[PDB]
Amino acid sequence: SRFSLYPPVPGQESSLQWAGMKFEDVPIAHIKATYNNTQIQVVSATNASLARASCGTEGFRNAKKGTGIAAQTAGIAAAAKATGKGVTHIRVVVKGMGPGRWSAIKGLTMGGLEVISITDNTPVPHXGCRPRKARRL
Amino acid sequence: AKHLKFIARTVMVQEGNVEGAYRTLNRILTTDGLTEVISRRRYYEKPCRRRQRESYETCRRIYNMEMARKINFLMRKNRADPWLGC
Amino acid sequence: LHIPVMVDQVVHCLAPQKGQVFLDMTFGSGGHTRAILQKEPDVMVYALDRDPVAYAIAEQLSRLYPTQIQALLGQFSQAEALLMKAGVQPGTIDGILMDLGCSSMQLDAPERGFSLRKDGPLDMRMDGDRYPDTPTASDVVNALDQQALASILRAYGEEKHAKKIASAIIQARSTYPISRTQQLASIVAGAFPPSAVYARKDLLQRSTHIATKTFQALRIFVNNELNELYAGLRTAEKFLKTGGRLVALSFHSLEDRIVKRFLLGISMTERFNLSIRQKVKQTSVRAPLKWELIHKKVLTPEDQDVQDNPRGRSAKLRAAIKL
Amino acid sequence: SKNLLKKFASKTRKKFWYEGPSLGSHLTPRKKTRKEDSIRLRVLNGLLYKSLTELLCTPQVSQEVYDLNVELSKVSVTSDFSACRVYWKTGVSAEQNKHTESVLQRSAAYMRHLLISQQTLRNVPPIVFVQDKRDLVLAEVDRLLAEADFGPPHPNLCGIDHEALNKQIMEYKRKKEHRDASPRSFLLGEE
Amino acid sequence: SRYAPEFREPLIDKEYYRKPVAELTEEEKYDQELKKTQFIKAAAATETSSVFADPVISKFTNMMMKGGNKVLARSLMAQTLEAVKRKQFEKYRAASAEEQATIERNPYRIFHEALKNCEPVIGLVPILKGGHFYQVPVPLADRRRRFLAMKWMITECRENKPRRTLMPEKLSHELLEAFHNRGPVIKRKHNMHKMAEANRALAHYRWW
RNA sequence: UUGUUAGGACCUAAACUCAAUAACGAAAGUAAUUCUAGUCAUUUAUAAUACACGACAGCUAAGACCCAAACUGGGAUUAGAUACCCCACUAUGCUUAGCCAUAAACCUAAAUAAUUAAUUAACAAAACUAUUUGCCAGAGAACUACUAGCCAUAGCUUAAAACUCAAAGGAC
């Protein structure tokens, strides 16, 4: 009789629907937030591309391409393309820990899309590849 | 990669509060230490550097936790003066 | 003989073609101008120089090409009026070549006073008899005080030892007039012990005299090349066609800075930090770039080639297109 | 035998610890700067930052406050220890921030009770909730901008005054054309 | 100052003192009782209970005064108001009954609505960050917003006028043109606001 | 090129959290999981000209190669920038054989058995007795010259004097 933060377990049967679709059917908004450019892609649950955007494609350049307001504009642009294709609910898998990590999610909301969940897929190696050397400053 | 998608590190939005859900997901990742881990994996920390940092952070946590005990212990006596005038 | 240095880079960068009008603000010997007129025989070119001797060379070479080369005489600042007297025939100039420094003929000839190695009068004045009242280097050294004279060496010659060298000149001029190039070189080399006379090795890995900075300083101050250069680049932009290619050669940092800053929208007016808390990084600009730098990348001539023309070792070629 | 902690045990003992059974004058409910005070106020700011985040994003305070899910920008106690200044993160929406400000402030007394009751901090002074002035101004510079109407649709460069130097040259051309502290005085008798 | 900090600014509102005791809010009622045991500053030579005294116009007069010539500055303001009243009376008489309704013939009401049309909501503060001068959009207070409107008027007339025109003839012609949102003083406000949009992202540098 | 793949291949390289732990080993060093082999009794200290080991870098031959990266090239910065910052890419870091034998190889604490009072040079890590071996004798010259040994050949270990100075050095 309460809300569950935990996503509906896959393979089972749940009582939660969004526009007549189950959790496994809602399209996914893949946000890659890096320290320079924030890219956004929306796909259907069958992995078919519907919208794409990024600070670069919007027209920002160099250090402006990696700001919060630049990602917000990129999110609004991705929403508009997806909204035309017929998307109202999105599952936000946000990879990356850059400046437009949250702003890209805020732009998608401003653009008329309804986020039902937020996942994080930032790559965390379990022991992997040696990172580049520390910068001296 | 071989696990199931949308079970790990996933939060559900309640009543269209997309900011509240994002704030919860960050506390989960920060609490599990993923945020610090990802921060330090951008560049390479040398094994000698890693050991020096961990030994210092451990000793800083001991002296901090111990200083908290001493203040909390000595704050019981912190009350209105009972012998005012003497 | 002095081959025009890095002319091939200029020639390729300029791409002289028929139906295009070009300008040369530093004809001098004319080696660079002749190279532009050899690739394209139908190209239109205008020449200019501050030396009346150089202008005569252009007029003599005008016989080779009657109308392809147009000779003019004057400074960078006076270039606009000279091209205005001609009319709008230069008009939308496709390219302005602003080579800098001393002419091969000027410095090879000891009489002109530019060479410290040879013995000549201390004229060091690119201008000839066109203006006889233009003060020469002899007047500059004999008139200016240490404060004024030291600034010339420090500002124009990048002289590390400015107070000591200036003082020696002031003492020497009082004993006798400083009228000869070698006389001045000894005076500058006398502020220091005899060991320092020929000690200052260069990046070339070749030793040089200790008074080379004083001759460079006086050369630029007597002819005010740097200030006049500021007006020459500004007038080239005004007279440069939209989409036209500018090409300059800078043989020292001071001229390179004005060319380096001009072609990137930076200003020579910019104040100077002095090796304390310089914000190379912060641990923005009024407007964007106004040029398409074909070769923002700069380089000196090849070190093997440098041996053949040591005067041109520090030649930095800066190319740009007007926006 | 070999202890990694020994390397840094003595360094962190002067930076993060002081000796003696003395509590500061400020820490009471009711001068010369000291290093112990910097330690006694640094640890409280961390405990309150840790403990005041265990109230905003937890259900103890209230149901609306729990739903508010207020993350905190920083916590900073006054040196005098009269009161506290709990800065809180402020979303862009000014109207929602105004409502959130009122909500938090009403429960300030109860939030203090929750920490004092749990025994994390024995004697906590009154709490305050403040909006970062930097954030407020940036929001105001946007409000006024929307309301605002934009109307209907050479010698000094180098650093040497060549002109002045020319005049100085042309003008010149116009003219041309340990011992007394020893016991000597005492040992002689000159008193 | 020759007044000690314990002195209070005088209150020169005639109606305030003669109001019935019950009509006064208890806060105002309390202050009056307190003031009976305090020191009151003497009223300024220009502070009076006159019904025709407007603080805004009196302030505008002081911003035009040069070298303490109050008689001349007040005369210039008196000539201006009259020049505006005479300019609207001519238009009113030479206008149809329908047009006559809109025409405003009160010079005091043309002055206040003129100034308010010139006031800017946001200003700029000049800042040198890393040896470069940047001006950051600022939100202007009620005092800074009012000062700039009066300053911009007194400067357009003093400078940008023909040599033989007089201030009562340029100021009157500008109060009326600002009153209609067409003047150059309004154009200064439009430029200030437009620049703030250009520097919209540079407000972060503010430290005050 | 980029983003996604609940697509395929790969098994190269390195082992998050646990670890706020303080274990094992002579030291060096060692922490993804499983299995096999395996550490153990000399009273105790005390060893070289012998024997067996010994991070990283480096050398030799054949392989590996995800990522990192001396050098090098390209781009910036600067008076210059053979650098710090950016990009690319080698030797190399990996495996299998052998060599090399050096580290601030530092708990800057030789080992062992006692004592805690009849004991503050300073600081660090409280003081101090006994036993055995090693080592030291002003500073620099000098991790050098010569000698001998060594798979080492621009190498390691061993290691002076002339001469110069009146100090050098440690703690506060």
Ligand SMILES: Nc1ncnc2c1ncn2[C@@H]1O[C@H](CSCC[C@H](N)C(=O)O)[C@@H](O)[C@H]1O
């Ligand atoms: N301010 C100035 N105005 C005009 N000419 C100048 C000048 N400063 C230097 N010059 C001239 O420009 C030339 C630069 S050196 C010679 C280069 C020339 N292209 C040649 O082929 O010889 C010299 O002739 C020098 O006298």
Ligand SMILES: [K+]
């Ligand atoms: K050590």
Ligand SMILES: [Mg+2]
């Ligand atoms: Mg390079």
Ligand SMILES: [Mg+2]
């Ligand atoms: Mg390789």
Ligand SMILES: [Mg+2]
């Ligand atoms: Mg050794």
Ligand SMILES: [Mg+2]
């Ligand atoms: Mg070790």
Ligand SMILES: [Mg+2]
């Ligand atoms: Mg050695």
Ligand SMILES: [Mg+2]
């Ligand atoms: Mg040796």
Ligand SMILES: [Mg+2]
């Ligand atoms: Mg030897």
